[PDB]
Amino acid sequence: HADEVWPGLYLGDQDMANNRRELRRLGITHVLNASHSRWRGTPEAYEGLGIRYLGVEAHDSPAFDMSIHFQTAADFIHRALSQPGGKILVHSAVGVSRSATLVLAYLMLYHHLTLVEAIKKVKDHRGIIPNRGFLRQLLALDRRLRQGLE
Amino acid sequence: MHADEVWPGLYLGDQDMANNRRELRRLGITHVLNASHSRWRGTPEAYEGLGIRYLGVEAHDSPAFDMSIHFQTAADFIHRALSQPGGKILVHSAVGVSRSATLVLAYLMLYHHLTLVEAIKKVKDHRGIIPNRGFLRQLLALDRRLRQGLEA
C-alpha cells in the first residue's frame, strides 16, 4: 500500500518500494527511503527504472534524532514534486513514524502548514479500506440502513 | 506492533500486537477479534490464560471476498466487548488494514447509526501517524521554531 497525501506525494510501505510493476504504474520518479541501511546499498532495480533515490539512515526509536534529516529530506521531496510529472514515494521498512515524520516536516517547511494542519492533511488522505470490494459492501450496508433496516 | 484507539475502548491494531502478551496485558485488552482467523489453527492459546475472549472470522483480503456475511456477528461481538465494564477490544487481521477496519466501520454504522462517511472520518481522525514520541517532540520543536520566527 501507498496513499497520496499531497499531489504527487505518496506515503506507502516497504512492499510497495519493492513492487517494480507498481512503482512503474503510479509512475514514481523518486523514492525516499527513511530506513536506509548503510550496508544494503541503493536498490538495483531503481537504476533500471529511472528512479532517483535518497536514503536516510533512521532508526525508529525515541532516542534517534530524525531532526537532522528534516531539511535534506524536505529539499529532496521538493525537488521531486517540482519536476514536470514528478512523483515521489516516501516509506521505510516498518511503522509509519519514519516516513510520516519526513512528510510532515516537508509540509511545514515548503507549504507553510503548522504541525496541526499538516497532521490533519496527511490523516485525511490516509486510506483505511483499499479493498474496493469491501468498500462496495460497506456502501451497500450504508444504503440499506438509511432506507431504514435495523 | 501498532494499535489505534479509534473509538473508546476499541483498538484497531495488527498481528504483532495480537501476539504481544506484555502489551495486551498493559493495554488491558479483554477481547480480540481476528478478521483473519484460520479454522485449522484455532484460537491463540495465550488468550485462555490472559482471560481474553476471542472471535475469529475467516476472511481473505480480496475484492471478490464477501465480508458482508460477517458484519452482524462481528458488530455484535464488538458491542458485547464494549458493553462489558472495563471491556477493551483489539480488532486485527494478519496483513493490511482492510479486513479489520471494514468490521470496525460496520460496527459504527450498525450500533451508533453513523453513515459510512461519518464512520470513515471518525476512524481516520483517530489513526495516529507519529507513534514515535521522540519524533513527535522533534516535530513540535520544529513547529515552535517556525512559530517563534513568526514572533517579530
Q: Which helix (H) or strand (E) holds A143?
A: helix A132-147
Amino acid letter, residue B83: S
Contact of A30 with A78, CB cutoff 8 Å = no
- For β-strands A30-33 and B3-7, DSSP reports them as unpaired
> A 112-131 residues with CB below 8 A of B?
114-115, 119, 122-124, 126-131
Residue carrying the nine cell digits 532517483: A52
Helix (H, G, I), strand (E, B) or coil at A60: coil
Q: What is the CATH number of the domain that holds B6?
A: 3.90.190.10
Contacts of A68 (CB under 8 A, 6+ apart): none
Q: What is the DSSP code string of chain B?
A: --EEEEETTEEEE-HHHHT-HHHHHHHT--EEEETT--TTT-S-THHHHHT-EEEE-----STTS-GGGGHHHHHHHHHHHHHSTT--EEEE-SSSSHHHHHHHHHHHHHHH---HHHHHHHHHHTS-S---HHHHHHHHHHHHHHHHHH--
How far apart are the CA of B53 and the nearest CA of chain A, in angstroms? 26
- The whole-angstrom separation of Cα A10 and Cα B131 is 19
Sheet holding A30-33, edge to edge: A2-6, A9-12, A88-91, A30-33, A52-55
* Whether A142 and B64 lie within 8 Å, measured CB to CB: no
Residue B133, φ and ψ in degrees, nearest 5: -70, -30
* Whether B138 and A100 lie within 8 Å, measured CB to CB: no
A111 touches chain B (CB under 8 A): no
Chain A residues with CB inside 8 Å of B67's CB?
133-134, 137
Experimental approach: X-ray
* Whether A97 and B127 lie within 8 Å, measured CB to CB: no
Q: At what angle do helices A97-110 and B133-150 cross, to 10 degrees?
A: 10
* Whether A145 and B65 lie within 8 Å, measured CB to CB: no
- The whole-angstrom separation of Cα B136 and Cα B138 is 5
Q: Number of folded domains in chain A?
A: 1
Residue B140's domain comprises 1-152
Residue carrying the nine cell digits 504504474: A25
| Resolution of the model in angstroms | 2.2
* Whether B123 and A122 lie within 8 Å, measured CB to CB: no
Contact of B66 with A137, CB cutoff 8 Å = yes
Can you read off the three cell numbers belonging to residue A136? 462496495
